Amino acid sequence: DLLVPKLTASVTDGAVGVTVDAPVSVTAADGVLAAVTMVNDNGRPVAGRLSPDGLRWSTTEQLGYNRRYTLNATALGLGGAATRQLTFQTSSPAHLTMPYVMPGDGEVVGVGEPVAIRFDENIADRGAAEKAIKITTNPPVEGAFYWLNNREVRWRPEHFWKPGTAVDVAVNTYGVDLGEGMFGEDNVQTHFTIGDEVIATADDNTKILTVRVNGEVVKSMPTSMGKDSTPTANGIYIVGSRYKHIIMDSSTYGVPVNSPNGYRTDVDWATQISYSGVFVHSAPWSVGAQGHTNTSHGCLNVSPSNAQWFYDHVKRGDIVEVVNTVGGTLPGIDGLGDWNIPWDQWRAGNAK
Ligand SMILES: *[C@@H]1CC(=O)N(c2ccccc2)C1=O
């Protein structure tokens, strides 16, 4: 004869510590769903949708933390009715943390821009954070996570992006335990595209900064780099913020302004290429040295003409490579020196 309806929920009655990273759902068997309601302690209805066939019902909005939810469902069929009531307690985070993703949604960036996810708290379970971040690419390319510090994680392929590539980032950290009770405050989703290949190279042996667009030299800039005592580091740099004019306070980098190697002046047409202070800026006071000798604290001294041209034609994510200098190699965890870490080490990751 007719069979008694059966109900199924994605939560268990009496569950404590239920994660809010997924929807709560009720499914019916041997019948249809006649009524479903979910409420918090205070009694406010939690939004939900029922499938046209009446078999599946799921929550249509996020669920809060430290909540006591009550789910009431009724199934009807030819073989009778069934009513269930459930109550579960959602997660109680010891602390929350909001993610911050760059580059911004819709941007077009150079072939060296890595996907960056920054949290405003230290992350204790890095693997949980890597698992909660989805990275889609078209054309699909291999990539890998690597942490610069306890709070920011990066993702890039082995070699520079092939132009025209779409990148989609889905940081689905809400409802996910990130260690020691650290849960996500919200989710984020950005998308960006890779633009022209723009690789600029600065050779200390020639003291010249050459900008190449799509493999073709388009500009040759005489420059003066870091002097022997405060030299520019060799390696690959990624282009960051661009300023029509920027006040260079030495204290920003921990070096006191009232010091031999300190400084507090205002320069024009500055393109940041290092968190540690390396720039490409306008330096009128060194035109004579530019192209011959080094007389700076680390940034590439360029004429106002060329500096502005650099400002106008170089976008976030383009590459600046420095070679044959007397200084060392840019640290891989600088924040813009990601490509200076060997691919094997980067791929391996440091999730611990
Ligand atoms: C790199 C960092 C900075 O701000 N620099 C500087 C510009 C003008 C005068 C003194 C120092 C650099 O060389």
Curated annotation (Swiss-Prot):
Entry binding sites for substrate: Y263, S276, G277, N301
Activity control summary: Is irreversibly inactivated by the beta-lactams carbapenems via the formation of a covalent adduct resulting from acylation of the catalytic Cys.
Binding site for Ca(2+): D177, E180, G181
Protein name: L,D-transpeptidase 2
Pfam families: Big_10 (PF17964), YkuD (PF03734)
UniProt note: phenotype after gene disruption: Inactivation of this gene leads to altered colony morphology and growth, attenuation of persistence and increased susceptibility to amoxicillin-clavulanate both in vitro and in the mouse model during the chronic phase of infection. Loss of both ldtMt1 and ldtMt2 results in phenotypes that are unique and/or severe compared to the single mutants lacking only ldtMt1 or ldtMt2.
EC number: 2.3.2.-
GO molecular function (one): acyltransferase activity
Residues of the L,D-TPase catalytic domain: 198-323
Oligomer and partners: Monomer.
Function summary: Generates 3->3 cross-links in peptidoglycan, catalyzing the cleavage of the mDap(3)-D-Ala(4) bond of a tetrapeptide donor stem and the formation of a bond between the carbonyl of mDap(3) of the donor stem and the side chain of mDap(3) of the acceptor stem. Is specific for donor substrates containing a stem tetrapeptide since it cannot use pentapeptide stems. Is essential for virulence in a mouse model of acute infection.
Taxonomic lineage of the native organism: Bacteria, Bacillati, Actinomycetota, Actinomycetes, Mycobacteriales
Keywords, ordered alphabetically: Acyltransferase, Calcium, Cell membrane, Cell shape, Cell wall biogenesis/degradation, Lipoprotein, Membrane, Metal-binding, Palmitate, Peptidoglycan synthesis, Signal, Transferase, Virulence
Regulation: induction: Is expressed at a level higher than other LDT paralogs at all phases of growth.
Organism per entry: Mycobacterium tuberculosis (strain CDC 1551 / Oshkosh)
Membrane association type: Lipid-anchor
Residues at the catalytic site: H281 (proton donor/acceptor), C299 (nucleophile)
UniProt subcellular location: Cell membrane
Classification via PROSITE patterns: LD_TPASE (PS52029), PROKAR_LIPOPROTEIN (PS51257)
Top-level enzyme category: transferase
Swiss-Prot/TrEMBL GO biological process terms: cell wall organization; peptidoglycan metabolic process; peptidoglycan-based cell wall biogenesis; peptidoglycan-protein cross-linking; regulation of cell shape
Record-annotated site: Binds to carbapenem drug (covalent): C299
